Amino acid sequence: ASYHISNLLEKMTSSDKDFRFMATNDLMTELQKDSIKLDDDSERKVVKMILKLLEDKNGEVQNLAVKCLGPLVSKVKEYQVETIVDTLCTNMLSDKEQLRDISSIGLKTVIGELPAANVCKKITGRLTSAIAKQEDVSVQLEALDIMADMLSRQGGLLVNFHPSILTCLLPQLTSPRLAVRKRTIIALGHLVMSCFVDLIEHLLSELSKNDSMSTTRTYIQCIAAISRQAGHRIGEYLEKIIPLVVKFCNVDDDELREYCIQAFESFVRRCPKEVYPHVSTIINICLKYLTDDDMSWKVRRAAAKCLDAVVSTRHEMLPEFYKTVSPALISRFKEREENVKADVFHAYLSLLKQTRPVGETPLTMLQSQVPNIVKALHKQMKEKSVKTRQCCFNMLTELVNVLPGALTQHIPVLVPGIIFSLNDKSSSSNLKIDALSCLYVILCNHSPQVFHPHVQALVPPVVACVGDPFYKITSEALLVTQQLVKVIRPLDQPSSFDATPYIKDLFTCTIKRLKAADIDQEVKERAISCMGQIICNLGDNLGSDLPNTLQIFLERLKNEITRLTTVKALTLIAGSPLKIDLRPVLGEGVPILASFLRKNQRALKLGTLSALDILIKNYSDSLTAAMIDAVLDELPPLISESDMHVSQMAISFLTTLAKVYPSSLSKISGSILNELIGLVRSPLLQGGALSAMLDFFQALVVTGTNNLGYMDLLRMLTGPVYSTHKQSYYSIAKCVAALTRACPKEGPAVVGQFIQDVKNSRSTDSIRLLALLSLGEVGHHIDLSGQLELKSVILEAFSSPSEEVKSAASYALGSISVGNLPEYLPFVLQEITSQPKRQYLLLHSLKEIISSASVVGLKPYVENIWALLLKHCECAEEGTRNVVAECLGKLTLIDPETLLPRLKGYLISGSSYARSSVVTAVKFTISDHPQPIDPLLKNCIGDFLKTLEDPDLNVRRVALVTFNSAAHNKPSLIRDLLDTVLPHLYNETKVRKELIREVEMGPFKHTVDDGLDIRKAAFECMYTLLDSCLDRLDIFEFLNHVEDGLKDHYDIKMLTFLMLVRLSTLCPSAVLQRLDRLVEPLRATCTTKVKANSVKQEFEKQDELKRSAMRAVAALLTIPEAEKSPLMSEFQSQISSNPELAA
């Protein structure tokens, strides 16, 4: 209320500090939290009181008033803001230093609080005269700092005041004080980002004209600063800056530092330039410039650092780097003080990083240059500085990582250095850690043979490193010990090394770490992994300690911390060439491992399932029933369609158990079988898991158990069908086929299925479809040639009212032919020509046979199939032509060397239908995964694309479709042929006025276009080219055609809008150069109106096109520097609705 404000104002003059501090704090906290109904007179008194308190004699009150000044200006009338700014400005010029500091801090706080326009203009108007060359250095410093802060906070405004700011800032560059020069350089750098576009021209001209006079390093520093803070804008002046700087490279004065820095900044920021060799030579000659007393060392630092930008930014210059003196000088120059050596080593690390892959390859050159690096590192490994040794170890690690096996002959000289580094007392923890890491990396990426003679010299250091109070070094030593154990006794190769004398020590250093006794968790995990590896590799050499140490595995299984590590170690131990006796532990371990399946841990579930599988597979003579039902009690929960991997692992475990322990197969008749049956019909069931289930079924059928026979399984499988997804039918058919394959003596089953299929009465479509699928799957493997009544009923099933039965019969007709080609293939081949009313399904069956039959068995009939397909190439029906072309394409896959020339030779004089079929057939040959036909297709696609790109219309369409398919699937084939193909596509992307046939009826019109399809295919090809073939193309020749297609048919308009949206993100500069001609069609789209008396759907069809155009222009507006507004501010009532709908 007013009374509270009045009493606070009255007490603010109590002459007592405690009263003056409490009232000000209350006022500040009230203003900070939604001050209520503050009358203008109250603002006046508050402002006056705060301004007077700013001059108080106690620092605390002044500081509190300064802090309160911030939240004050949040809610006050603008006039009080103006008068506060004016008062601060005039107090800034006061002689008193305390007043100057207080005013500067208050103005900085006000500027920081403000997000408004006139305040900044007045402040800038005052500071422009303040910064002028006067006799008060402190005032100049404060004004420069304030203007720099204001420019940094906001720069969008003050567009018209920028020339005055530049004019006042420019003379300050020659001030005798260097602090003034640095501050005005920072201010100019801040100002450059705000600006307008013209001011940079005057600034650059002023810098250029000042440089070609009595010069100072301040100008070079300013140039470097404004180039660092603004790179793209100053790019066009690269030609007018470098020669003048190079002219100053020969001055005896040590001013080369600034030149090296601005070169480094330019190379970091501005990539486009073509003066690399000259600057590289300058840097190389300046790197060896040496002649504490003499200041000649930061020049070397800058020269070495400048090469880092060249190495890292550029990737296509790697052969030029390797062949030149770029790495040679660095390898030679490795004897210098710590800082220069460190930065040179960092540059070489960057060079090695660039060498990593995405005649003389860079890897080959690096291998050839390895010996010099090895010699340099060996010479540098005797230094007493830990930093040099750390850098050498990092170099070794990077060199091993980039290419394995490089250090093959250099082991006998590199090992002494690592041993000396590890054994040195003055070495720090970091040096030991990185040396151990380098040793582990070298051991893991090299053959064990080279390390054998040094095995005697490598074990004591690692053993000593194990006994270290620092846990990180102990873990690194354990990791190195694992690789040492792997190397000394390999199991995948024969070795004659004797690792016996090193056994006990490797145990002694490990078993003590196995007994944790409140030790680090990572140490526990590493010790457990090393102990398990020791058991797996060197178990035979162990004596009586194995049974004692085997219980520690159970103890580490009991707790949750090391469950996964112990499970993995046990799995590794079980799956070893050396049969370790795990029987005493297995009895207790199996229930514990089984109990882990209840908790919801996917990784633990998979690990324990794998462990149980491997344990029951290796050890099957020591199993009891109790552990079996204990394990199987949790299986039904694990079998569900939600998790396919867990179900597959459970099926594999069940199959292994049935294989090794068929006795306990009577306990799966309950919930497990029901879950398996439910999973059989799951639509998501696919992949090897399905195969696994099949295997399981076979195994069960091999075993034989009550209520688990073949007939019972068939009844359970076919119950619901005989009493819904197609994949369920396919899975049931595959299961029935596998079960039939399990028992060869199952003849009556086929005849029963035949009776069910042929009996029309009391037979549903589902039963017939299932019978057809089962017969087809069964006949895929075993011969049915000795059984009659097959072909008749299959051909009868073709004439069915349901398309599912037709498809099933067509698929199953050729399925038996896979087993017996000579009897069935001629039959269908002759039936194709004999009966024309069913040749479609016969051709589909022939395609199925070609896809499924073995190549070696299909080779003799290749000529007959090719002759039949070529004779059927010219047909009146389109679907028959597509099927024939697809069959030809699939047949092309086998024996391509003989037949590809034959399709090659048909291009010379083939008819339009023949040429179209030839182009279509090669389309199906391209696959995403690599194929043996890839080089042949690469070599012969040239005429399929280039030579036949415009014979006729339909041929053009099929060629464009084939090109689109090739680009989508395997861009590598068309990667090198883009230059000779793109002009043809651009020709195809033009509208032709001879194929438009207008049909008019009264006042109505119906335009019919024939070459819409060709244009649409060309546009689809253009869109597909962006995915992988966008780098090597002229962007303008794409953008002009995009603009041309912007005014194309309605269907192509959406594709063009999508292309514009995609190009908004990719290469914004090219769109910027064409932002004026890419919007006029987009503006016409949002303005066009349709003629009245049209249907309602014709009213709404523009209502998505205009929305799409609105979205496209909104996406185009997202370019950072797309400030140009081509009459965009035209928002009447109707158009303005679209913005919010699009957003």
Place this chain on the structure above:
Amino acid sequence: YVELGLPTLTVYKESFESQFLADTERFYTRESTEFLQQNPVTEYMKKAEARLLEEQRRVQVYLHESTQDELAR
């Protein structure tokens, strides 16, 4: 399908949209399950991005705008 059913999209949703969404869900679930088993997650990320871009292209080329919000969800 948009024109029939007299914008009213009753026929379009009843006949085509629901079935298309169901098959899309099943196909994508199967593809993710089969891809995560062999190849690592780094390639799966790029495959998911490419599939999302392709679905956006399809829905903006030959599908109704009403399906844009649901399918992307």
